[PDB]
Each structure stands twice: as C-alpha cells, then as structure tokens.
C-alpha cells in the first residue's frame, strides 16, 4: 500500500530500479531510497486538484509536469494526471509519455542553441528573417500563428514572439545532423529528424525515448540553467538488497553546450516571460527563463473534427527554469480532439508560476553571471 499522490513517481522508481539492477522491486524484497521531495510533491498534487492555486475551466483538463534539480539531475516531483476516479495501480504516467506535441518549446533546444553553439550566429542581436518561406525541398509554406510576417527582426525578438519562419530556417543553417547530435546530448532523439521538427516534437515511433516528454524537457532545460550540463533524470539514490549489499547511484554529467551558449539562451528566454508570451509565468522577484508552446491540429483534423472560428489547441506547454530548479509543463485533454479554449491556454504557465513560487521563496533568488567571452550591449549580448 502507498499514498494517492505518489503513484506516478513510484511507477518510474520501479522502472529505474530494474533497468539498473534487473530486479522488479515487487518480486524482490529491497529497501529503495528516492529523490522525491515529499512536501514539494504534495504541493504539486495540490496545484492540480484544488481551487487554491490555479483556476481550471473544467474537471477533465489534464496537466503533466516534471521538476528537476538542475545541479544533479534529480527529479524531485512528477505528476502526469489530475483527478483519477479510477484507481488502478501504476497507470499510464503521461509525464514520461511522449505521444504529445511539444511544439515551440522545441525551438530553443533544436534551433537557436545549436545555431549559437556551432557559431552560425554571433549575438542575441543577430538579425534573422521572418519573411514568406518554404520548408526546404518542398513547396509547403511555413505559416505563423497570425499568418503574418514580422520581417527583419533580432534573434531575441524572434524567440520571444515565437515566429516559425526564422525557427525553421535556422534549423536549415545548423544542418540536420548537427541538430540530431545536439538533441542527443540533451537526452532527446528521433528515429528520423525532419524540418517539421524545428517547430514540433512530433515523431514517428514514441515506442520508447523518441519525441519529447515533460521528463526529457525538464532534463534539457536544466542544462540551460547550470551552464550547459545534462544529467540523466534520476529517481533513485540508493538500493539496499535483502542480502545486505548496497548500490549507490552517483549521477554524472555531460557537456551539452558551451557556458556562453547556455547564458545567451537564458538571456533571450528571460524576455519570453517579460515582454512576450509566458507573462502568465512572470515573477518580478525570481531570475527565471522559459519558452511557451501551443501545438496545432492537422489538416485532416481541422476540417473534419475541429469546428470553430476561435484560437484553439490540442496541447499547451511551458518549459521554464530558475537558478536551482527546472520544470516543464504539458496541458491538454486525454482525447486530443477536445480543443483548448481561451482560458484553458493559460493553465500551463499558471501551473509553473504556482510551483515555482513555492520552491523559490525563502532562498535568495540568484541571477546568472555573464561569463568570459561575452559582453553587454543595448538590449542584447555579443561574443568575442
């Protein structure tokens, strides 16, 4: 027997234990030590299932998120579902499932960071292009949400207003190989990477690790926060077997990107919260950065199943980090064909604010130090 809220976390614990030790912890007696912050976790559960912290439009709107310790890669809270009036043990943990499109939140890790990393761009002020543009190799247009084109704009503003044209084109200038490599270093992969992926975590498999889940996004954005170091998500700290033996799990890092890249990305993403999209996640007293996401429906879907004139979406996403914690939010309905309307779209950002409020208040919120090889200028940062 076990608590209501812990269901999702234990499921991953069991999965991780037998991946590293090869023992289903239900068929073998062993004491296992985890990274779950109980208070934080109960607080997470409280944001989902009350009227205290977030105003929901209805009882079946889903939220799914994962919170990581940026310094070691320890998942401290996870919750893939809200309101579960059918308690069957260890259900489908949506928080690690990848079968939903993370849309624009893929831009930072797939497009601009690698672009900067491999020195395709020199500054957060480099002028990039939002003009009529086509997916390379095809006569298919890359539309923006507003169907318009902002023209000549800076990289920073491009990320902020979240324009699809400069995003896609930037994937083309990085190269598809380089990008697949960069995503791997951030723990994300596709069987096959395509230009569509510059604005979508939409994959062909999702049989395993392919695509993006709140797990893999939290793990990726933590690298932005700590200066470019990816840690594999961890749930377990130590195992003690019946036979007295003990295996401790030390979580080691890998260089995902240069510290200057990690910084430049952070700096731009700061403006997302302040001047642009995720203002519903803005905290005046907390040094944080993020990217919003609003996926869309397919051509088939638009005509046959979705019937409205309004701004609608199957998924709304947020992916923010502070100096200490990384958190990635997914929102939507179990059946994708139920669209997100008006107020439903703010939930992702509001959820993050609420949970980030809790973890940060008390300890002094430290900002990011501008590191060797970068200097400050106007609204932007430049290299050397």
């Amino acid at each position: 027997n076990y608590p209501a809220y812990m269901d999702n976390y234990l499921k991953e614990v069991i999965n991780q234990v037998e991946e590293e030790t090869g023992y289903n912890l239900l068929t073998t007696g062993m004491d296992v030590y985890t990274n779950v912050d109980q208070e934080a976790q109960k607080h997470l559960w409280d944001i989902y299932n009350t009227d205290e912290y977030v105003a929901y439009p209805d009882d079946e709107l889903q939220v799914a998120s994962t919170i990581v310790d940026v310094s070691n890669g320890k998942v401290i809270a996870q919750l893939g579902a809200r309101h579960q009036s059918s308690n069957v043990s260890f259900g489908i943990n949506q928080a690690v499932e990848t079968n939903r499109d993370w849309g624009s939140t893929m831009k930072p890790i797939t497009d601009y960071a690698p672009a900067l990393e491999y020195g395709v761009y020199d500054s957060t002020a480099t002028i990039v292009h939002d003009e009529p543009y086509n997916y390379p190799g095809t006569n298919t247009p890359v539309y923006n949400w507003d169907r318009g084109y902002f023209g000549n704009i800076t990289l920073q503003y491009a990320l902020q207003q979240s324009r699809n044209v400069p995003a896609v084109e930037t994937l083309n200038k990085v190269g598809l190989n380089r990008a697949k490599t960069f995503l791997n270093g951030l723990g994300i992969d596709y069987p096959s990477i395509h230009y569509s992926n510059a604005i979508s975590s939409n994959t062909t498999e999702s049989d395993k690790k392919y695509g993006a889940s709140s797990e893999k996004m939290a793990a990726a954005y933590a690298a932005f926060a700590n200066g470019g170091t990816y840690y594999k998500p961890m749930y377990i700290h130590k195992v003690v077997f019946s036979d007295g033996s003990e295996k401790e799990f030390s979580n080691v890092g890998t260089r995902a990107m240069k510290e200057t890249t990690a910084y430049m990305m952070t700096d731009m993403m700061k403006t997302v919260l302040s001047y642009g999209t995720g203002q519903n996640a803005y905290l005046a007293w907390l040094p944080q950065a993020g990217k919003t996401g609003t996926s869309n429906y397919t051509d088939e879907e638009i005509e046959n199943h979705i019937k409205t004139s309004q701004f609608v979406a199957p998924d709304e996403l947020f992916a923010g980090y502070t100096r200490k914690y990384s958190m990635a939010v997914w929102t939507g309905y179990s059946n994708r064909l139920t669209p997100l309307v008006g107020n439903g779209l703010t939930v992702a950002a509001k959820v993050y604010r609420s949970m980030m409020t809790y973890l940060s208040e008390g300890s002094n919120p430290e900002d990011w130090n501008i590191p060797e090889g970068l200097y400050r200028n106007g609204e932007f940062v430049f290299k050397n």
Binding site: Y2, D31, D37, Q38
Partner: peptide
C-alpha cells in the same frame, strides 16, 4: 516480497 520506499529525507513513504 516486501520492499520499502523512502523520500529524499529518508523517511518511509511506501511499502510494496
């Protein structure tokens, strides 16, 4: 048979 789960503080939270 019987397994015990402990949070980040090391306090028991689940028995499986």
């Amino acid at each position: 048979t019987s397994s015990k789960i402990y949070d980040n503080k090391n306090q028991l939270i689940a028995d499986l």
